[PDB]
Design a protein around this ligand. Structure first.
Ligand SMILES: *CCC(=O)Nc1cccc(-c2csc(C(=N)N)c2)c1
Ligand SMILES: *CCC(=O)Nc1cccc(-c2csc(C(=N)N)c2)c1
Lengths: 12, 229, 229, 12
């Protein structure tokens, strides 16, 4: 799945 | 819990060591132990708590998505069973974070920086629950995420400047909540645009370091808008 | 254990799913459950067992090295305590793998491909124990690693061609054991050179796919020799 | 620490 930008560590 | 016997300062020190070692499950357990000491958290400590659980839940979300994709393609009980196992573990991590916030981080947070920080976390962990939720349970979880983000937004708009990194990260996450959880893409685009534009107009008030902090999050709003419009 | 109630085939299927999801701790637990069914493992299943525990122990080794480096620089008990915590967990993972090999993977392995595979694993997990060991304990652990690698080498030289990927991976690891565990850099360089040269001379016998498999490991011997000479 | 090449996943 295309994941959008969210706050903090991009840990997924 | 198992951290009851360790000094609060020792738990914070070990959380920082676990972060350096990329031992995020340990980092989260140390910070859960620090919160349970009952004292309020400093800004650095709030950040340690958030980075710890974000990394933990991040691994679970990435795993859940791989499993859900395999399960959907397959439509034996094994894929469903294993996707359920990872899902239950993810839900357990969210319930843990939400429990710390409800007992008693939020009620003891009076300053805007701490209160907005915790309410944004509450929004985020209900959003992670909503990503895996189905039907009616999903509706109530979505409303809980919305309610926490809304309260955080109201406080942030009243008490913080539009370039405040906490305010910016909140708006970014609330915008993604609108786009793909609440199925309100227009609300998402409107919030991202307004937030970006109001921060742009306030950049002139900042120092070189604050400018770097704010522009980093504004770039995230822009990345989303680029993909949404 | 906790996997006693699950079908062997279901545990293998879930190990493959966990690998896709990058859930290596789950992958290792599924494979430990499959081994404990008591049946011998196929080549694919041996590979699943090895990849699972290698990823698990890899995270622990990387964490241990970061912590040990901070501890050495610091020379409060926290750094030592936390390095000890990670160390004990790493030792527990090695003891688990060694226990599976000793009960009863090795004794039931009659074919060269399975026997060499398990003896190389035994060498590797004693080597991981030696990386964290001190003094006399270290000496005995080093001899146990040496003994397992030596027995695996003797069988590999008698039963497998010099391009066999298992034989090549064994020689590569035994060479690194010599270089930095046994403090025998000359033995390490000699073993890496001989292994590379004997495989080079046997490449003409291979198919396109086997050629790719063997040359991949030979490149590793070359990478080490480049840094050693 | 400089880690030398070993077999399989470079997981450390
Ligand atoms: C809110 C004030 C603030 O940012 N204070 C502060 C002081 C020292 C260190 C941090 C910090 C932010 S992220 C982080 C980490 N990942 N360890 C530490 C914050
Ligand atoms: C020894 C014969 C052999 O390599 N057989 C085999 C068959 C199918 C799949 C694998 C294999 C190697 S690594 C791997 C994995 N990481 N899942 C699977 C091996």
């Amino acid at each position: 799945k295309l994941m959008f930008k969210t706050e903090g560590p991009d840990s997924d | 819990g198992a951290m009851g016997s360790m000094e609060r300062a020792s738990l914070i020190q070990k959380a920082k060591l676990a972060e350096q070692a990329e031992r995020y499950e340990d980092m989260a357990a140390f910070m859960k132990g620090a919160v349970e000491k009952g004292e309020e958290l400093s800004c650095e400590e709030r950040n340690l708590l958030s980075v710890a659980y974000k990394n933990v839940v991040g691994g679970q979300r990435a795993a859940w998505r791989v499993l859900s994709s395999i399960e959907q393609k397959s439509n034996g009980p094994e894929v469903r069973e294993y996707r359920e196992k990872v899902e239950t573990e993810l839900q357990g991590v969210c319930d843990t974070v939400l429990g710390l916030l409800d007992s008693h981080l939020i009620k003891e947070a009076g300053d805007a920086e701490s209160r907005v920080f915790y309410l944004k976390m509450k929004g985020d962990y209900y959003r992670y629950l909503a990503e895996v939720a189905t039907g009616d349970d999903k509706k109530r979880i979505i409303d809980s995420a919305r309610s926490a983000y809304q309260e955080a937004m109201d406080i942030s708009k009243k008490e913080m400047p539009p370039t405040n990194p906490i305010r910016l990260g909140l708006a970014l996450n609330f915008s993604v909540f609108h786009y793909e959880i609440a199925n309100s893409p227009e609300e998402a685009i409107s919030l991202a645009k307004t937030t970006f534009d109001e921060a742009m107009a306030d950049l002139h008030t900042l120092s070189e370091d604050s400018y770097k902090d704010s522009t980093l999050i504004m770039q995230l709003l822009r990345d989303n808008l680029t993909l949404w419009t």
